[PDB]
Amino acid sequence: DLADRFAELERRYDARLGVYVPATGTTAAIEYRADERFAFCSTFKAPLVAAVLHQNPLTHLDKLITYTSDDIRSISPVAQQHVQTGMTIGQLCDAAIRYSDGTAANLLLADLGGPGGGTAAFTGYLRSLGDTVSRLDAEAPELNRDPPGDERDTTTPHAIALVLQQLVLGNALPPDKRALLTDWMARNTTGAKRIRAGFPADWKVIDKTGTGDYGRANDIAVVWSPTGVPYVVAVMSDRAGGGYDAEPREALLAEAATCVAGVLA
Numbered sequence: 001d002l003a004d005r006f007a008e009l010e011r012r013y014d015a016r017l018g019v020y021v022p023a024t025g026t027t028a029a030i031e032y033r034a035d036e037r038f039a040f041c042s043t044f045k046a047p048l049v050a051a052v053l054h055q056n057p058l059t060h061l062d063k064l065i066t067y068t069s070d071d072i073r074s075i076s077p078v079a080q081q082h083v084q085t086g087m088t089i090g091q092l093c094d095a096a097i098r099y100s101d102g103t104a105a106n107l108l109l110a111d112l113g114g115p116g117g118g119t120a121a122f123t124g125y126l127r128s129l130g131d132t133v134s135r136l137d138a139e140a141p142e143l144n145r146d147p148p149g150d151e152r153d154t155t156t157p158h159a160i161a162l163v164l165q166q167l168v169l170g171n172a173l174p175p176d177k178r179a180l181l182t183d184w185m186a187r188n189t190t191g192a193k194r195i196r197a198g199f200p201a202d203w204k205v206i207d208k209t210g211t212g213d214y215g216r217a218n219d220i221a222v223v224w225s226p227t228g229v230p231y232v233v234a235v236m237s238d239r240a241g242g243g244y245d246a247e248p249r250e251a252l253l254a255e256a257a258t259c260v261a262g263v264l265a
């Protein structure tokens with residue numbers, strides 16, 4: 001009947017909803033449109049930091065990156081205030097996750113290198129994690145603005161959840177790099193009204209949000225129960241029928257998360 005409740009949320013919010021919660025040692029998977037494609041939007045910035053971590057020693061986090069005001073092409077709460085001084089890779093990782101900083105993400109893509117400003121390299125990192133479906137094609141902000149029919153810049157709830165599972169809970173990263181990613185997600189500033197809002201206060205929530213055109217609103221999270229049992233929760237939504245300027249609905253994500261919390265508690 002949980003599928004019926006998700007379908008009701010879709011009707012109430014005039015939206016398309018995708019959910020994946022991987023199975024665990026003691027719980028079944030939750031899946032709703034889990035193999036349909038949704039735009040990443042800024043959700044890709046969490047695996048992007050993982051990519052950078054993966055291919056460099058941690059001393060690289062101290063590498064100073066310089067850039068100009070002309071590089072501020074997307075919403076960049078941190079980067080736009082440090083044009084004169086530049087930012088370290090570590091600082092860029094922090095900003096990309098906790099403030100969804102677009103310039104920071106673009107500079108991290110460039111740090112991977114190669115064609116498409118690092119977008120091919122990012123896609124390659126997902127392939128290395130066994131993700132045969134996801135792809136990044138554009139930089140910020142263009143990656144948020146593809147038409148609904150376009151497969152560019154898309155993932156699926158199933159794909160991104162299994163990536164995050166490996167990153168935070170698995171051994172895709174060594175413990176030191178894993179702890180950095182986890183902490184940045186744990187101190188995210190953008191996600192209070194999404195998955196966090198759907199779980200009780202005694203659950204811990206770490207997350208990365210995404211928002212875009214056609215009413216896109218996403219959140220990917222790892223949650224810990226009050227006794228410290230972890231789960232991955234991916235929730236994705238759009239309103240392709242509501243125009244490119246359809247309002248994204250944080251409340252839809254919060255309610256979907258409430259329904260998930262009910263299953264997992």
